[PDB]
Amino acid sequence: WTGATSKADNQNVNDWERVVVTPAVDGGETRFDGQIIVQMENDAVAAKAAANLAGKHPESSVVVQLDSDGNYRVVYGDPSKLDGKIRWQLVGHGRDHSESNNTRLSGYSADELAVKLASFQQMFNQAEKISSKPDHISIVGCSLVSDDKQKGFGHQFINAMDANGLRVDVSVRSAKVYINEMGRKLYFDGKDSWVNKAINSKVLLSWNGQ
């Protein structure tokens, strides 16, 4: 399991596909007062997974599509309701690329991603006339990748974010997709198959401040 084999389509946000959000009928409870869900590539799995996350908390979630140039569009929700400390969820495919140890999320190394998000933080709040900053960032991979490469990117990302002026807690996990004809939520193996895993793994990194 080495994530998606395709090339990340992360350019020209205005040409991306949009998915309708449907309010989850058993949403649940959440810590956060609100959240921004950032879809980082034009991919059907990512677009749907992003919409599914927003569905869980339809009244307090904002879905944003964001390309490599820093351009974005709000495809769901009301950013004006975002205030204070919130959650970010990043949705895309993890990919291992040949000549390096590391992994990349929607085309970006952890450092490149941190630079773009720090820029997005500045631009988005000013454009939308709001005062918000992430308290926690959840990385939601749409392709199955091993536990260790998940942990590796997470550690790189949380340090890179801090070097760009944003100290946030970071979690990393793989998303499941409900497969209607199979009637089950399954993981995409990054290539051509759905995978049923009995056990889900999630790593949570947090600043101690000690």
Side-chain angles (χ1 to χ4, degrees), residues 53-107:
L53 290 174
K56 295 188 58 174
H57 304 99
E59 305 307 301
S60 54
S61 302
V62 178
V63 184
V64 179
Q65 294 177 337
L66 174 69
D67 63 32
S68 188
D69 288 321
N71 290 96
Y72 72 91
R73 61 183 190 178
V74 183
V75 295
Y76 179 85
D78 181 12
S80 66
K81 270 152 54 184
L82 301 169
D83 188 50
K85 298 178 175 302
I86 67 181
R87 165 169 69 179
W88 288 4
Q89 305 212 51
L90 311 178
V91 185
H93 287 279
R95 297 176 179 82
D96 196 333
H97 297 165
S98 152
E99 189 180 56
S100 187
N101 171 346
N102 307 336
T103 173
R104 295 193 160 220
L105 181 60
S106 293

Side-chain angles (χ1 to χ4, degrees), residues 168-186:
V168 295
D169 296 345
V170 171
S171 71
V172 184
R173 70 178 184 92
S174 298
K176 273 180 287 116
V177 184
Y178 178 71
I179 307 307
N180 305 165
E181 291 190 306
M182 292 183 183
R184 279 146 177 85
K185 297 174 181 176
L186 305 169

Side-chain angles (χ1 to χ4, degrees), residues 78-182:
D78 181 12
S80 66
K81 270 152 54 184
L82 301 169
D83 188 50
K85 298 178 175 302
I86 67 181
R87 165 169 69 179
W88 288 4
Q89 305 212 51
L90 311 178
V91 185
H93 287 279
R95 297 176 179 82
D96 196 333
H97 297 165
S98 152
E99 189 180 56
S100 187
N101 171 346
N102 307 336
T103 173
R104 295 193 160 220
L105 181 60
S106 293
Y108 316 112
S109 70
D111 282 281
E112 291 168 0
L113 178 55
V115 173
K116 281 166 194 306
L117 290 178
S119 173
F120 171 72
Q121 161 72 0
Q122 294 294 271
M123 279 178 47
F124 188 76
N125 284 274
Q126 184 179 59
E128 302 297 328
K129 308 181 200 62
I130 59 174
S131 303
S132 78
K133 70 178 304 167
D135 207 21
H136 171 100
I137 301 184
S138 298
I139 294 174
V140 182
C142 293
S143 290
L144 271 185
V145 294
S146 64
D147 288 5
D148 298 337
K149 306 207 298 191
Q150 260 179 90
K151 237 185 203 163
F153 189 87
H155 276 280
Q156 295 171 359
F157 181 66
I158 191 171
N159 285 307
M161 282 294 293
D162 179 66
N164 282 276
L166 286 180
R167 178 161 299 201
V168 295
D169 296 345
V170 171
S171 71
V172 184
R173 70 178 184 92
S174 298
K176 273 180 287 116
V177 184
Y178 178 71
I179 307 307
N180 305 165
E181 291 190 306
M182 292 183 183

